[PDB]
């Protein structure tokens, strides 16, 4: 396509896998919360969880916008296309996704053999994580967002594919939403064999506590955080959720 020259990532995620396919040099701006690898803290802000700031994106004449359609406003991206912008969109459903993304973007690098790298190192890591992580047994699990509301994921949707590859199986996973709102109920009833929450849940004491008796997974102690940045962003770090997620579901073998 071409060696672009000012870039704009929006999203979390699309600035880690910009600077991983030896772009982030060109970045002109980025996310809010896009900040890895850190030095992106010092890129301005065009996007946040609801609104894509179009006329500041005017202001920077981008050559290159990543783009996240699963996360930001469909009609910004909308209006970002009919205005005539080059747009990589980065796909977020799968773990063999992330080399892609990685490789594309790659293709518009004044040095694409770092990209290359980068995806072939990222390849050859998730093989040897599929390989060392193939013994896991079919484990159901809970992964919280967020204890109030209590939001979950279903439907395939990110980070589903993370837990699929241990032999996770979401409780929620036949839900009319990608990411339905439960109640406490909604869990109890489940009776989950896992439950993954949030480092902050865990050091303020977490909410299941409370509910040792009717669930399993507190009395065999298996409510446990995961790092939300490797996990819920699809980037290189990924790679570390997946052994993170792994090894918990591999203990949780031991009943
Ligand atoms: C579900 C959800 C939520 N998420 Co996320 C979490 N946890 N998230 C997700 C999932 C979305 C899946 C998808 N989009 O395909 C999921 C797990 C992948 C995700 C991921 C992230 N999220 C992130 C954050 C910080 C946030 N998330 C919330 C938006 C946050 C929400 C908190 C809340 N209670 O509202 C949330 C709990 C529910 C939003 C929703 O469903 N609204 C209903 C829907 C109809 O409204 P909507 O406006 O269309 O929602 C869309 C956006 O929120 C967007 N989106 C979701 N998260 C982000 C984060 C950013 C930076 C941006 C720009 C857009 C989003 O995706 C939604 C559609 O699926 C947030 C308000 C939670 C909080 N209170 O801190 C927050 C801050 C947003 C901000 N200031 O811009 C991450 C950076 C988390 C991390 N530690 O890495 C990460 C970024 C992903 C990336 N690609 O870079």
């Known amino acids: 396509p071409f060696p672009a020259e000012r870039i704009i990532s929006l999203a979390p995620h699309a600035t880690e ?6 772009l982030g040099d060109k970045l002109v701006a980025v996310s809010e919360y896009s900040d890895y690898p850190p030095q992106a803290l010092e890129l301005e802000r065009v996007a946040n969880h609801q609104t894509i700031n179009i006329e500041k994106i005017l202001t920077l004449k981008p050559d290159l916008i990543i783009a996240w359609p699963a996360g930001n406003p469909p009609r910004e991206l909308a209006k970002l296309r009919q205005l005539g912008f080059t747009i990589y969109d980065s796909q977020t459903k799968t773990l063999d996704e992330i080399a892609d993304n990685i490789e594309a ?33 079919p484990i159901r699990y809970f992964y919280q967002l967020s204890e109030k509301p209590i939001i979950t994921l279903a439907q395939g949707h990110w980070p589903s594919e993370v837990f699929s590859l241990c ?11 990608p990411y339905p709102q439960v109640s406490i109920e909604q869990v109890l009833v489940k009776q989950p064999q896992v439950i993954f ?29 995961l790092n939300a940045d490797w996990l819920n962003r699809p980037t290189p770090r990924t790679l570390d959720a997946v052994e993170q997620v792994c090894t918990y579901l591999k203990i949780a073998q031991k009943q």
């Not at 896998?17 to 030896?22: D, F």
């Not at 979401?170 to 939403?177: L, P």
């Not at 909410?207 to 669930?215: K, P, S, T």
Request: negative net charge; without cysteine.
């Open 167 to 177: 032999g996770g199986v979401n409780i929620f996973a036949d839900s009319e939403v």
């Open 197 to 225: 929450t949030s480092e902050h849940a865990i050091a303020n004491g977490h909410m299941w506590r409370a509910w040792q008796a009717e669930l399993s997974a507190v009395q065999n102690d298996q409510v446990w955080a």
């Open 105 to 137: 973007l790659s293709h518009y690098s004044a040095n694409p053999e770092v990209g290359q790298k980068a995806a072939h190192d990222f390849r050859q890591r998730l093989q040897d994580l599929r390989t060392q992580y193939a013994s896991n047994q």
């Open 17 to 22: 896998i910009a600077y991983a396919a030896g």
